[PDB]
Amino acid sequence: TLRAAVFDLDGVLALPAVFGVLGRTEEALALPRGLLNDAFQKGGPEGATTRLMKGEITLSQWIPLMEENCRKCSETAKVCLPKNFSIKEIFDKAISARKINRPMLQAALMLRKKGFTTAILTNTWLDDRAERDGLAQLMCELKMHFDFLIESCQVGMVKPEPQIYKFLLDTLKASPSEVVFLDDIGANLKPARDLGMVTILVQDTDTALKELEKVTGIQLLNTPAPLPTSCNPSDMSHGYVTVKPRVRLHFVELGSGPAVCLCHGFPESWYSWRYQIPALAQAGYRVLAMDMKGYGESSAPPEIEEYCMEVLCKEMVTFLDKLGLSQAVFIGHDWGGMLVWYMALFYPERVRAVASLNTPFIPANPNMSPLESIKANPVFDYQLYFQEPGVAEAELEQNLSRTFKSLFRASDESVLSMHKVCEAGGLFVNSPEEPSLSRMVTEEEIQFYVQQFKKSGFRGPLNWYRNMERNWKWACKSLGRKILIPALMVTAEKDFVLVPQMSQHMEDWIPHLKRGHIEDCGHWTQMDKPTEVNQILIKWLDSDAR
Amino acid sequence: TLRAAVFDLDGVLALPAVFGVLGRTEEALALPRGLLNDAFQKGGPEGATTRLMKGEITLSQWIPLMEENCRKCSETAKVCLPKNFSIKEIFDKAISARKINRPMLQAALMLRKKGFTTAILTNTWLDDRAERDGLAQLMCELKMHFDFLIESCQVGMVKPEPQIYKFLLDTLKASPSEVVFLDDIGANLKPARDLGMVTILVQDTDTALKELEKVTGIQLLNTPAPLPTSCNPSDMSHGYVTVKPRVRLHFVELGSGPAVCLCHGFPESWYSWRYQIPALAQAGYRVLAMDMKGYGESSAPPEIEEYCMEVLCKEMVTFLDKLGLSQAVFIGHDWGGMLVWYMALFYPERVRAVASLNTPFIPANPNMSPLESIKANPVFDYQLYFQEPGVAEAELEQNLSRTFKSLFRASDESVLSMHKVCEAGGLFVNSPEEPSLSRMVTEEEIQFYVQQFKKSGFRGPLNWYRNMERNWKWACKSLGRKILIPALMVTAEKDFVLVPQMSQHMEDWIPHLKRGHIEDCGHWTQMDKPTEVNQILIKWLDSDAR
Numbered sequence A, B: 001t002l003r004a005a006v007f008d009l010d011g012v013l014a015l016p017a018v019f020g021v022l023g024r025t026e027e028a029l030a031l032p033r034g035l036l037n038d039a040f041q042k043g044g045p046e047g048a049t050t051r052l053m054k055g056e057i058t059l060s061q062w063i064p065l066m067e068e069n070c071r072k073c074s075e076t077a078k079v080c081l082p083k084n085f086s087i088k089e090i091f092d093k094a095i096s097a098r099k100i101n102r103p104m105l106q107a108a109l110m111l112r113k114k115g116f117t118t119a120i121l122t123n124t125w126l127d128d129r130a131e132r133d134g135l136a137q138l139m140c141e142l143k144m145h146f147d148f149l150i151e152s153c154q155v156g157m158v159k160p161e162p163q164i165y166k167f168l169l170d171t172l173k174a175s176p177s178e179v180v181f182l183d184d185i186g187a188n189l190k191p192a193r194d195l196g197m198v199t200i201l202v203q204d205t206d207t208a209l210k211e212l213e214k215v216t217g218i219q220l221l222n223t224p225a226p227l228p229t230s231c232n233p234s235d236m237s238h239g240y241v242t243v244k245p246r247v248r249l250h251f252v253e254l255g256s257g258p259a260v261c262l263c264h265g266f267p268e269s270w271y272s273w274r275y276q277i278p279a280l281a282q283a284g285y286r287v288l289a290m291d292m293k294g295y296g297e298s299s300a301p302p303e304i305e306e307y308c309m310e311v312l313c314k315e316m317v318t319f320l321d322k323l324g325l326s327q328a329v330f331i332g333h334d335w336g337g338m339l340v341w342y343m344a345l346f347y348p349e350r351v352r353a354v355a356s357l358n359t360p361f362i363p364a365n366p367n368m369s370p371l372e373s374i375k376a377n378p379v380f381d382y383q384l385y386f387q388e389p390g391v392a393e394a395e396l397e398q399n400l401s402r403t404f405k406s407l408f409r410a411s412d413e414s415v416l417s418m419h420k421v422c423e424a425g426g427l428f429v430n431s432p433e434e435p436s437l438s439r440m441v442t443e444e445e446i447q448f449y450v451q452q453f454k455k456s457g458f459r460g461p462l463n464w465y466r467n468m469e470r471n472w473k474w475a476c477k478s479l480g481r482k483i484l485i486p487a488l489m490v491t492a493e494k495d496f497v498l499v500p501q502m503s504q505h506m507e508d509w510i511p512h513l514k515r516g517h518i519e520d521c522g523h524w525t526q527m528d529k530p531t532e533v534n535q536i537l538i539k540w541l542d543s544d545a546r
């Protein structure tokens, strides 16, 4: 009974196989067949390549040794090498052209989700080339999806030596019959097979995967579109910035490149961006997923005014001051979405680009109170219910598990009616005590929000709604301004509070405004439609936030 | 009696004054005198410029309004503007050319160190230009050195209106007679003077500063070279990465750009890089100042083997994996210096560039035990004293204040003899119980190390020395390798343990090796010679680590 799956890198997890460059280069340079491949493997276990793969020498130390071997092979074959022939050039092109074999990684991901222990066993080198980063990046993306990465140059052993296979079994803590071994080289499969492991000679991915699903009894081939990579809270880098003596802000940080500050809505967490964090980091960005003031590990002072937009924005500026960031791209959802438009309005020098999910830019009406403006919309009734301190806190904190399960639902899953909330007496009047689990969330994900909300509760989060007059007065100072920095508005078809039509007049204030739209998407955009959110944000970031 | 100093930005803290572009552009374009200056101030308090400075409109909204004013002024003067005349072009050039007035900032720094409350009061705009970052960066560098920054566009008030001066007094919590007000515009000084404040019309910095020192009774002019900016632990972003279930690594993070990982020595802290952190962040780097395993907020497991170079290096690789960093430039001092050469040897794909302070790259002697090799040098005796678990811990933890005060000393301040330590019985046998404070450190700085060492003590730190045989066996695997990635070796003339001559044969292993050298520098390089360390590292980073 199989419990582990082992994959090679070259020709298995990454395509095209770097070994294949030698065959094509020979064919392009009209060189004799197998000349480059024979000079590469010249000397066998005592040769320059085995020394490289064992970690005795580095790639740059190997280049002149392979050049000698190529000259020796051309001398014997009675042929001449071209005038400007370069092994570094050939290898640089072979490595940079090699990409992740997405369907193989998907199959590995599926086997791990199903309880398998997964590992990458590869014959590789210590790369000290000027362009080593390309390969470094490839390995980083791949490695994080496996339980183990065994590299020949790090263990001082090489395939097909039987020692690396016993090392693999020991690392795995599994007997050979419990292991599937995927490799594109038949000579490297023999020892695993000879040990008793299930082996798959990988030629085309499709057949390899067909052989894989047959031996595992798990569907891997032509299975549905997987959700993007999520975040395990314990594996993240956690950052803490004191913005004021009583106020500290917490954030999760991943990636390198231009700073992308993610601002969640109500009643959420940095974890609301769980499906965007690994994707924006992989796309070339330094993501900073905030716990906004009043939430999770961020401070939650009790006073209402600590949560007005003026104070929240000043503290986000200080957060950048203390981190040594002159700018950041600001991406907000819901209450975070409103915060980001005001960051762009009051601090454009600090905002590289601004993006909002669901929340339109809504300019203050100087001829009307916000309480009047709220009353004009029946869908906004819950905001009046949120006004009296203590009332919504007591109902939302009574059963944390019920609160998040009732709230975090897809458009066809609604168990809550946000209309006539005040007259009913509460948010959960004709709502189930034990709501069903939404298809958007797992029990574990809901429990992370429950755990987060145990520290400060709902006072701080609800205080974001308790500054209408203060926010209105502050917003009126910006009534003659326009948003002229790069800006993205993303609407969600099925958000029944923040309806797409609420964003219709945004171009009057933001003329160069770019847009995105998500159909069959409810209020909880990031977890409802993570794949499309990632696609819209990444495309916009690369074009406008550089 | 003066207690506060207020400085304007344009023409005072930053030169050349942006107002001066209008005069030079007129002169370059052979335009009538004062034409650009008159169109800029056109309409006075009701004009486009006052609206800009009050925050009613943004800079990009202002550009076409200034263009109208310029056309109106040319129409009256009966002159024509050039065919490709652009206010955006003129202003972009004026802003980017404007730099910090270093001697004025130094005087502000000196007044604050002497107990003054300092502030920047400036007439400024909301900058939404594509090139706003240049100005954002300028303000970030400057603002962090003052208690307050009052910007006209944020307070909705402008100089010379008397309201901004009463707002300043209220922000300051000082009466007018306690305030020095520095401004390059006489019209903007009048209200401060009329209120009773000491005022200085700033023309040339030298005279302004001469007037400043006379009224303050504090030497500001031609005073010694100041130490680089240091770090206040409470104002930093603190990062936490779990690398293994029992091991968490702590770091301080500042700046944006290529990742620079700083690795301290024994018995130190991230705080040993206090003078390098703000300088490398200002030079365009994302600094990650580590608390190495066994130190400060990083985990300190008790077992000896948790501190061998193989485990320490693997955990630094994981630290990069979890932060989403494919590479980092690795800069080490002392034990951190040794760790970084081994990072370059075993993980060149993860190391962008490598730099060491004092620690040479020393390749393992396969024909000798490290215990034998240590005994060959009388200056290395303390390492044998460090071997027996508990002995050096008990002596180093007995009096934390004494330990750091005795250790952290300049070359002419030595109170400790590291020779014949074993025979004497300890590290502090003929050492004072109450050592004098070194000129390199303050009492507050020593107390930060005392506080840090109260958590785990010296077991973890001392365990770095207790893996000689293990480190030796591991290092022998790299005996055929060369360091071919960018590398910097920095020697300190007066380091009597890690003598510059110990680095003499490094080019045999690292042929492209670059060097730096610091004279009159002891073991504690970063705090001994911070200015020269910053100059050497910054110059090397910009040339080799890009």
Ligand SMILES: O=C(N[C@H]1CC[C@H](Oc2ccc(C(=O)O)cc2)CC1)N[C@]12C[C@H]3C[C@H](C[C@H](C3)C1)C2
Binding pocket: A265, A266, A267, A334, A335, A338, A359, A383, A406, A407, A409, A410, A411, A413, A414, A415, A416, A418, A497, A522, A523
């Ligand atoms: O109220 C705001 N968020 C709510 C958070 C809770 C959610 O509850 C839901 C959502 C969906 C469902 C479902 O499908 O069953 C049920 C309950 C409703 C939206 N957002 C703002 C954002 C800005 C600033 C201010 C005024 C205006 C513009 C709306 C708050």
Ligand SMILES: O=C(N[C@H]1CC[C@H](Oc2ccc(C(=O)O)cc2)CC1)N[C@]12C[C@H]3C[C@H](C[C@H](C3)C1)C2
Binding pocket: B265, B266, B267, B334, B335, B338, B359, B383, B406, B407, B409, B410, B411, B413, B414, B415, B416, B418, B497, B522, B523
């Ligand atoms: O021992 C190492 N650091 C000491 C830390 C304490 C300091 O104590 C001092 C220093 C100066 C003074 C003074 O001026 O009074 C007094 C005491 C002496 C140096 N560094 C290593 C770094 C690598 C790896 C291993 C072997 C070799 C190479 C030396 C440890």
